Symmetry: D2
Subunit: 115 residues, 4 copies
């Protein structure tokens, strides 16, 4: 697991469960191509997006479908989604955890790069 | 205006109006003594807490009464309050803005320090 | 001034000065077209991006060029940029402030929306 | 483990390792009494602070010694510490994770209350 996503809900003080997550990789023509996707588990985590073999250096976009998440709780959101865009590069052995904390009108995202 | 406090609501995407804020200063005897207090305005800002004469070097604690804010809005939040503790004016007089962003189970705080 | 952008530096506790910001608007053909751009001032704020006449209903993306900011400061950050995507003016014209707080491996963004 | 603390570093994009954490419980005379303490592990987590038997309802303060953490990395911090004050109450089975994301001049803390 070189790439993991973890989402928390700042209103309910809980993991954000069942949030759809789509990952894209930037192609040579500068369009985003689908790479990996899933929905966060009961722990608010999404594992198994990719493998070391398929997660080569390049530019990736992780889109967290926050608007749908809030609407399924009856709560009015501001953003369409939360987007995390970064260059993945091999400087050594490396796991990337993209973390996100959601409020209806605010979010934070952090990268935890380990090993 | 060497010390200003600004509070925003991450649920509503609005300034957090009428938030009580108490500032304390650590005394000679290691005790937290009352320094200044007030309530945020409609802009979510609290001005005029102190003057450059009375805001001497020291360790200060800005307590933002987040629980009272949320309960006045029918939300039962996690935290009693947000506390922000820092040494001030240790390299001469500066201007300090203490910002806080509030959600029911979460907050962030940042300090913007100028001159 | 229906759209304003404010950026702060969480490492230095200061406004994030000279940050490039590009705003796009989703077109009829589902494409991101250029809407407006600018650079933050010494207060970390970007004013005059648009006018109430030209800021119509639509889906907007505010891209904050965080990587360029950090690299100009000798820091090699994680993110390419901060992207903030939202529907605007769907319930009539409002005033939008998009705030961002930046660290090398992290950012938060909140929207304050008035009238 | 009813009470866990997890700390991340937003500058280094990594867990915050070896951060001292002191927990207090409010006594009847309104003073804070030491309750539990430790230092975050290589994962930035601190487990085993307490037990279900000893973590009764009451008001607790979790102080994260952020200033020492930053100084041991050569980086100038603003806060003395990060403080999280909350009422622990039994509404059902409940684990509390106090999470914190640190920057030199900013921090966020969230409560994740599960089970
Ligand atoms: O973006 C801000 C942010 C994102 C996530 C957070 O909680 C975690 C995030 C990642 C990991 Cl590995 C562990 C924890 Cl507890 C957090 O406190 C702040
Ligand atoms: O995530 C975005 C964000 C934006 C602002 C914040 O507090 C402030 C910090 C500096 C200034 Cl000038 C104004 C404010 Cl409201 C903050 O804590 C987070």
């Amino acid at each position: 697991c070189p790439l993991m996503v973890k989402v928390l809900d700042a209103v309910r003080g809980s993991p954000a469960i069942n949030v759809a997550v789509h990952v894209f990789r930037k192609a040579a023509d500068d369009t985003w191509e689908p790479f990996a996707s899933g929905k966060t588990s009961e722990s608010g985590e999404l594992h198994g997006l990719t493998t070391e073999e398929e997660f080569v250096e390049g530019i990736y976009k992780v889109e967290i479908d926050t608007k749908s998440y809030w609407k399924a709780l009856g709560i009015s959101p501001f953003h369409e989604h939360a987007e995390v865009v970064f260059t993945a590069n091999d400087s050594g052995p490396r796991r990337y955890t993209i973390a996100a904390l959601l409020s209806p009108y605010s979010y934070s995202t952090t990268a935890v790069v380990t090993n």
